[PDB]
Amino acid sequence: LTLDEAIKTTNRRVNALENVVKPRLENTITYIKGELDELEREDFFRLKKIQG
Amino acid sequence: EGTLEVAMEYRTVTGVAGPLVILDKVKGPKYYEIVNIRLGDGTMRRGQVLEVDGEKAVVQVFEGTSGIDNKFTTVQFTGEVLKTPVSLDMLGRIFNGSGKPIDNGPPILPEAYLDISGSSINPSERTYPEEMIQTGISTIDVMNSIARGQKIPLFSAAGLPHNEIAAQICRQAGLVKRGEEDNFAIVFAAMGVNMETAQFFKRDFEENGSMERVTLFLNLANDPTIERIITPRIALTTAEYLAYECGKHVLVILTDMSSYADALREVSAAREEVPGRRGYPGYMYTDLAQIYERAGRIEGRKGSITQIPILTMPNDDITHPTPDLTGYITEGQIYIDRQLQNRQIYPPINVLPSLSRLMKSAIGEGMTRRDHSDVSNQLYANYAIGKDVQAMKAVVGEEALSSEDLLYLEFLDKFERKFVAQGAYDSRNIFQSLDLAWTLLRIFPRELLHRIPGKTLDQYYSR
Amino acid sequence: YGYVRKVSGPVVIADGMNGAAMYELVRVGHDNLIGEIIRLEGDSATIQVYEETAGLMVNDPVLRTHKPLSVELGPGILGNIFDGIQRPLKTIAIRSGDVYIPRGVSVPALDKDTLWEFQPKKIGEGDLLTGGDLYATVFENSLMQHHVALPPDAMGKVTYVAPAGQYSLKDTVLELEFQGVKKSFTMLQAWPVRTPRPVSSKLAADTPLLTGQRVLDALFPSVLGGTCAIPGAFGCGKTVISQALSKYSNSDTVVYVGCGERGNEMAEVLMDFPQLTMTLPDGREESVMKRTTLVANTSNMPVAAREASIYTGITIAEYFRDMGYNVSMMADSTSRWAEALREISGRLAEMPADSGYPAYLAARLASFYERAGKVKCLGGPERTGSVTIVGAVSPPGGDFSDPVTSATLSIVQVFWGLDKKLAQRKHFPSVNWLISYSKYSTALESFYEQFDPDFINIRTKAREVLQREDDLNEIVQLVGKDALAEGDKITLETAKLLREDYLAQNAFTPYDKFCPFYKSVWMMRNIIHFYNLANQAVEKGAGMDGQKITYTLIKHRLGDLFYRLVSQKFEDPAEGEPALVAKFKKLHEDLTAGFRALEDETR
């Protein structure tokens, strides 16, 4: 009984916890970079063009 | 006729920066006027004017701005938009990205010049598609079918045999025939391909004997990046001329739709424009629309254009901007699975996302069977349930698959084994394949089937 | 008059435009392309040339029309496909056989030569008419019953009324005189498209929009004149839902507009609507094509015209609203409109507030959605029309955090959440219950009570069952199929039945094409009543075994009745209301009797 419970917990972790958290980290990185950095750089460039 | 004017020649280039060449003191410019720049060394290259302001004109050359001097280069204003000399003789030849002949033949004698990026079809005049296509592959015609006028791409990441699949489709393409002069005249655009792949395409098309009816538009990666965007344009212009104003049906093939996207991103970044997702230009939806939204059946004419592009998920992610926009516009998709390729399946089509939005009209009484829709729905729905059963078995164990789950897993296994697989040149006809499709559907109980009514399949008879 | 100075894609710059005012229609170049002032600076000004700008030249003539964006909203627009600039597609194709859309054509919005049977109203000579008063009516065709109304901001005494008969649109009909001067009124009326047509008052709407789809009709209903949003990420094909609503809604008129919509879809619409018939109380065959107008311009059409398209669509909807009819408009892919705003604003170097979308995005989208509603019309008689807006916000990448989706969800009342999960599973409606929500539930309480008091309780119970099903699915995935409570088993059961039968419609089969409200209520009542009977059995079953543990045995012995429950959706509505209601009564009573007897057995 104990080995079945432990194996179920480990398999559930490997199949769900990491497999969901890693996409969460990837989506967070993608959103953070491709939105914040891109738009901040674009705003700075537009301001530079305005001054120019 | 109004008296003609020889094109003006300028030398007032007053600044060069990036891929853009600035001019001044221009007398009567024209927007998107094609210019053919001649350098001091005597070599020539083309380009387009991107903005017209006052007497200033901002031009983006094609071959690149290297080797241009502010006081020796000469710019000539042709005073017209870009035009491709479309003609019927263009069949059975090859062309560079810009359309220059590369088949060791004479330049095309045009029947009539047609400005590329031609006007749209009056939607009152556009008509729906109603004719299936015998591409030469089983799984496409059996499920997620194609209609003569329907656009649908092939989704396939890097390293997959999608190029070989496209070559097979092009060589095995043909009408259902359920004639030859009006038969499929295939146009094969090649946006940004490797030299080895280009040689493969040339050899496969020349040997297959399809050179009697096939035009290639090859554009290698070594070519200027801008020359890449105009390619899948020129190709569609020639397709429009051949189908609508010449009659014969066309099955346009575009390879590396992603390379076109990259070409756009690079050009947009050069132009310093507003970026959409992942740094791609914000108007790419428009500029894909202008490429995809041409295939169809204009009513007044018996021609038909059918579009089968090939994409490439960059990070093997369908959520990338290019596949996202495509799936928005392109009216369905055919999906290729990397895992199935790992399982050593030559046509690694994953049917779970492979859906044809216009298949409801491709099916009917003119072709296919009365149970085609129901069989397709069952083999599309039970596969997902079998995959869920496999996941549950993986997360619990072998005993988890109950008397019903085990049937779904066996259905999934036999489906991946027999139905999906096909020969490298297999013209498996629809009825013979639908027999084993119903066999797979009957692996599951003939009464547990929820969505399908038993009478629909009962119309068909085993053996 | 004026001449072009700078051209940059859709946005151009013209010099010598000193007298020009903002938002004034302007002719560009020799081809007289349409244009609307957006930014005026100095003697120069900025124009967003709706038509394609390729091939222009400096010093091309620019002619000021002195008038803002306007649509000829006279009679005859019904049943005709129009471009974003109201140009008639069919007339253009007939006049110029070239199927390709010409550039530089100036075909009028409505034909000046059509003869319409004109029916004057009870108006008399010298009567005091006011703005918005229906001085007459005209039959455009069967089931149209067009009502010619006096344009707003007009009044006077009837010095002349035209007699009944056929009339060209040039013909004057009313000759009202307010301040001595006698002005003539012709059939054609032009309204500044951007400005919202005036209403006497705005009133709360209490008439539910009957979509004919069980999930939207019951779980997330909408009121007539309400505002809705359908995300519909790539591949979901929301347009089938939109078309189903257009075919089977209770609206008096349909105004379908697609901005960025693919051309095939409009072909499909124009080819399939005329054959499809709707049954009125008279019962005669009639084509929804007469009831429907199409303002859509395809994706190949220039992007600058997206705004003009959507605003012309909504102003035509408003025009029909003032006529007393209840009209619904569907705005396919407003995300294309957002991209058009970004492209136009990008050229002007206007600062990108968020993800390239300009700052003034929420404002414009809010105005567009706010033109919807239920209003009391102006003039006499005392019409009460409405406009229903059901837009579409396609999420780039399928993330609802997108700016256009965010603003829409901020300003939308009822929201239907399309999800990729159900779409992949070929569910078909793909309307996720959790994300979708309706703010109109409180308003329609009176209608639900008068229709059926049970509806509120069964709806709440179904929502609770779905939420519990999601929670139990998560818990089981965490733990496993085993150690699953018998009560939890009964809850997951009939929730699977809900998902498989009630929440799903084929939408391409005769039975599931249109779901009448009464049969939807019957199916929901059957599901909830089976669930309640299961709860009662769990409560008392002569021991915990027979009560809940034997729920599997109950399913075995009640298999025929459960199959009847799951198959109740399969029946077609053509049987008629008495047949369906009798069958549903029989099914419910048989289920209750069998369950009670089996619960009586061994207990």
- Sheet-strand content of chain C, in percent, reads 15-25%
Report the β-strand fraction of chain A as a percent range.
under 5%
Separate helix tally of chain A: 1
**What is the structural class of chain C?**
alpha+beta
How many individual β-strands of chain C?
Answer: 28
What is the assembly state of the chains in this entry?
Answer: part of a larger assembly
Number of strands of chain A: 0
| Cα end-to-end separation of chain C | 96 Å
Q: Kindly state the percentage of residues in helix of chain C.
A: 25-40%
Main sheet makeup of chain A = none
Global shape of chain C: globular
The whole-angstrom Rg of chain A is 22 Å
Shape of chain A: rod-shaped
Count of alpha/pi helices of chain C: 20
Largest interface: B-C, 68 and 64 residues
The H/E string of chain A reads H
Structural Rg of chain C = 28 Å
How would you characterize the largest beta sheet of chain C?
Answer: 9 strands, mixed
PDB class: membrane protein
Keywords: rotary ATPase, complex, membrane protein
Entry title: Citrus V-ATPase State 1, H in contact with subunit a
Chain A: V-type proton ATPase subunit D
Explain this structure to me?
This is part of a larger assembly, with chains A (52 residues), B (463 residues) and C (603 residues). Chain A is built from one helix and no strands. With 52 residues, chain A is mainly α. Chain A is rod-shaped, with a radius of gyration of 22 Å. The relative contact order of chain B is 0.11. Chain B is of the alpha/beta class and 463 residues long. In chain C, 35% of the residues lie in helices and 18% in strands. Chain C has 20 helices and 28 strands. Chain C: Its EC number is 7.1.2.2. Chain C: ATP binds at residues 232-239. Chain C: V-ATPase is a heteromultimeric enzyme composed of a peripheral catalytic V1 complex (main components: subunits A, B, C, D, E, and F) attached to an integral membrane V0 proton pore complex (main component: the proteolipid protein).
